[PDB]
A and B are shown apart, each in its own frame.
Chain A
Amino acid sequence: GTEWEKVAQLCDFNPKSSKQCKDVSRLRSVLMSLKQTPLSR
């Protein structure tokens, strides 16, 4: 479970990236990041 924590600490796809262009692909990526976030233990 530590590998996911390291990957998050390195490249957490936080919803703060919404400051860029509102591209639907980036929105789906943020949604996937938010759905993967509960895996953090």
Chain B
Amino acid sequence: KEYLTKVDKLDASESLRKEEEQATETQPIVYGQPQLML
């Protein structure tokens, strides 16, 4: 049962990994800095 709780924590970590993937997909927005045209 404790290991099943750890598996639930692993699923939460997978959700955090999906959040990191979303952050990576949004990174091109921050990468588009207008100051790079100088």
Contact = CB atoms under 8 A, between A and B. Distances in A.
Interface residues of B, number: 3
Contacts, number: 8
Nearest to A35: B1
Q: Interface centre among A25, A28, A31, by most B CB within 10 Å?
A: A28
Interface residues of A, number: 5
Task: Decide if the interface of chain A is mainly helix, strand, loop or mixed.
Answer: helix
Interface of B: 1-2, 5
B5 A31 contact: no
8 contacts: A24-B2, A24-B5, A25-B2, A28-B1, A28-B2, A28-B5, A31-B1, A32-B1
